[PDB]
Amino acid sequence: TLLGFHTASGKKVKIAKESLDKVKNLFDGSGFTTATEFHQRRSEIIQITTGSKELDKLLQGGIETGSITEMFGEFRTGKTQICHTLAVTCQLPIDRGGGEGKAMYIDTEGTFRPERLLAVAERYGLSGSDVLDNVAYARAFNTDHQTQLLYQASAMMVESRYALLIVDSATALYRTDYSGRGELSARQMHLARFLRMLLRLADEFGVAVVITNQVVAIIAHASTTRLYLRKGRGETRICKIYDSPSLPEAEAMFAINADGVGDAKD
Amino acid sequence: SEIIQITTGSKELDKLLQGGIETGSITEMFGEFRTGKTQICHTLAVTCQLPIDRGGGEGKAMYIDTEGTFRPERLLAVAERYGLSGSDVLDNVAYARAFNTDHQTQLLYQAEDMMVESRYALLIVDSATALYRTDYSGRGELSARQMHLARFLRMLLRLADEFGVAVVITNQVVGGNIIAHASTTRLYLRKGRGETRICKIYDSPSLPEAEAMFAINADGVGDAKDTFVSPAAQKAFQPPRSAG
Ligand SMILES: Nc1ncnc2c1ncn2[C@@H]1O[C@H](COP(=O)(O)OP(=O)(O)O)[C@@H](O)[C@H]1O
Ligand SMILES: Nc1ncnc2c1ncn2[C@@H]1O[C@H](COP(=O)(O)OP(=O)(O)O)[C@@H](O)[C@H]1O
Ligand code: BEF
Ligand code: BEF
C-alpha cells in the first residue's frame, strides 16, 4: 500500500467507506430524444478555459467536460505546463471560464510542481492556499499503482465535486518496453482498460479527463479529442486539432509565460 | 410499399448506388478510423428528410449512437448546405445513446412504436459492433454474443421490412459473420491518398462491385471537384422549410 491521493499542500485525503462500497459496482434507462434537445444539452456542457484566448477560440470554449482530451507531442512542448494551468483554471467560476470543481493530478514522471499552481493562481487572483487544497496529487510508479489511483479517484469523486482529472504521461509507465516480445499484449490490455476506466469516469462524473502522451519524433476512442503540440520558431508554440468528433483540423498559437498558458506576447 | 432511394449528398456515390441508400434493406458501411462512416451517417440523417423528387425519403431520421460522436452541428451544416431550416431538420431526428448491448437491443423496441406513430425513413446504428466488439478479455465468447447480435440484426430486418425504413449500420474494421448475411447492401470505405476517400460496393445482389471517390467537406459528404422514454420525438414528420 503506497501513498494514496494526497493534496498539493501535503495533507492526506481521507475517504469514507460508503464511497468505496458505492463505486465497487463500477467498471463492469436512457431513451430517444430529438436532436434539438441533445444540441441544447451539449450547449450546457461546461468547458474549462486554458488561459489562452486563441486556444479557447480553437476549441470553441476550451477543455470539454465528459470526454477525454489527449494532448500529445515531443519533449518540452507544454503538456505538463498546460496540465498545471488547467489544474487551477478548473477551479474558476463558470462565468470566468472554469468548472467550479477541484482538480486531480496523477503524475507518472515526477514533474509535478505546486509552484506553477501558485503562480497561475496569483495570475488569476486566487488564494494560493486554497488552490493547493483543491488539487489532489498522486505520484504513480507502475501501471498497477496507476489503476489503483484510478480506483481511488472513482472513490473520491463522489464526496467532493471534481471537474478535472489529469493523467500526466499515462504512457510513461507503459513505454518501458525493454522486453522483447510478449509484453506488447499485456501492456496493451492494461492501457486499454485504463483508457476505458477513464471514459467511464468521464461519463459518470462529467469530469474533464486530460491525458498526456509522449511522442518520439494510443487506441483513441471515437469521442476522444486529440491535440498535437509542436514548437514553432522562437517562443511560439502551435497546437493542432489532430482528431475531433465536432471540430475540424485547425491550428492555433500559444505560449508559456511565467504564470502559465497564455497568448504569444509579440 | 415501393422502394425509395435516399441521396447520399455525393453525385458519384449516388450514381454508384444507382440512386443512393436503398430503403427496406440493411446497408452496412465498414472501414477503418477516420474513413467517413459517421459523417455519411450525419449526411443521410438530413438527406432522408428531403422530398422524394429531391432524393429524400420524406420521413424522420433515427440515430442510435454508441460512441458519443453524434453532433447536431454537422446536421445544421448539411441542412444549410441543402437549404433547409435547421430547426425542422433537428426536430425530425430522434437520437438515442446506447451504453451496452442490452440497451442497444431495447432501443429498437421503442423504435418500433415510434415508427408506428410517426413516419420514419432512416434508422442509423452508428457502430452497432462497438458494444459487441467489447472482447476485452473475452476474445472467444462467440456463441454467447453471437446470439444477441443475431437477434439485434433480426429486429433490424423486421423494422426495415415492416416500415420500409432504410437501416444503415456502421462497423469498425482494423463462426460465420451474421452481419454479412443480414445486410443486403455493403459499402467498404478506405482512405486513399490525402482526402481521397474510396467507397467500394463490397457486396450487393443487384449493384456491381465498383468504386467511387468522395470527400468530407465542411458541409458533409461531397465530391472532389477535379423506462426508455420519448418526449418531443413522438411528433410527426414536419417537412423542412426553406429558410432561404
Ligand atoms: N518557470 C517557468 N517560466 C516560464 N516558462 C517555463 C517555466 N518552466 C518551464 N517553462 C516552459 O515550459 C516548457 C516545458 O514544457 P513541459 O510541459 O515541461 O514539456 P513536456 O510536455 O515534455 O512535459 C519549456 O519549453 C519552457 O520554456
Ligand atoms: N467539421 C468538419 N469539417 C470538415 N471535415 C470534417 C469535419 N468533421 C470531420 N471531418 C472529417 O471527417 C473525418 C472523420 O470521419 P468519421 O466518419 O468521424 O470517422 P469514422 O468513420 O471512424 O466515424 C475526419 O478525417 C475529418 O477530416
Ligand atoms: F512532464 Be512531462 F509530460 F514531460
Ligand atoms: F465515428 Be465512428 F468511428 F463510427
UniProtKB/Swiss-Prot annotation, chain B:
Motif Nuclear export signal: positions: 149-164
GO biological process: cellular response to camptothecin; cellular response to cisplatin; cellular response to gamma radiation; cellular response to hydroxyurea; cellular response to ionizing radiation; chromosome organization involved in meiotic cell cycle; DNA damage response; DNA recombinase assembly
One GO CC term on file: nucleus
Transmembrane segments: none
Subcellular location(s) of the protein: Nucleus; Cytoplasm; Cytoplasm, Perinuclear region; Mitochondrion matrix
Resulting phenotype, residue 96 to P: In MRMV2; uncertain significance
Major localisation: nucleus
Binding, ATP: 31-38
The keyword Transit peptide is assigned to this record: no
Tissue specificity field: Highly expressed in testis and thymus, followed by small intestine, placenta, colon, pancreas and ovary. Weakly expressed in breast.
Gene induction: Stress-induced increase in the mitochondrial levels is seen.
Keywords recorded for this protein, A-Z: Acetylation, ATP-binding, Chromosome, Cytoplasm, Cytoskeleton, Disease variant, DNA damage, DNA recombination, DNA repair, DNA-binding, Fanconi anemia, Isopeptide bond, Mitochondrion, Nucleotide-binding, Nucleus, Phosphoprotein, Ubl conjugation
Phosphothreonine found at: 196
Residue ranges, annotated region (Interaction with PALB2): 88-161
Any one GO molecular function term: enzyme binding
Record function comment: Plays an important role in homologous strand exchange, a key step in DNA repair through homologous recombination (HR). Binds to single-stranded DNA in an ATP-dependent manner to form nucleoprotein filaments which are essential for the homology search and strand exchange. Catalyzes the recognition of homology and strand exchange between homologous DNA partners to form a joint molecule between a processed DNA break and the repair template. Recruited to resolve stalled replication forks during replication stress.
Domain notes: The nuclear localization may reside in the C-terminus (between 259 and 339 AA).
Assembly and interaction partners: Forms linear homooligomers, giving rise to a RAD51 nucleoprotein filament, which is essential for strand-pairing reactions during DNA recombination. Interacts with BRCA1 and either directly or indirectly with p53. Interacts with XRCC3, RAD54L and RAD54B. Interacts with the BCDX2 subcomplex RAD51C:RAD51B. Component of the homologous recombination repair (HR) complex composed of ERCC5/XPG, BRCA2, PALB2, DSS1 and RAD51. Interacts directly with PALB2 which may serve as a scaffold for a HR complex containing PALB2, BRCA2, RAD51C, RAD51 and XRCC3. Interacts with RAD51AP1 and RAD51AP2.
Disease as annotated in the protein's UniProt record: Breast cancer: A common malignancy originating from breast epithelial tissue. Breast neoplasms can be distinguished by their histologic pattern. Invasive ductal carcinoma is by far the most common type. Breast cancer is etiologically and genetically heterogeneous. Important genetic factors have been indicated by familial occurrence and bilateral involvement. Mutations at more than one locus can be involved in different families or even in the same case. Mirror movements 2: A disorder characterized by contralateral involuntary movements that mirror voluntary ones. While mirror movements are occasionally found in young children, persistence beyond the age of 10 is abnormal. Mirror movements occur more commonly in the upper extremities.
Name of the protein described by the UniProt record: DNA repair protein RAD51 homolog 1
Gene: RAD51
Shown chain mapped onto the complete sequence: 97 to 339 of 339
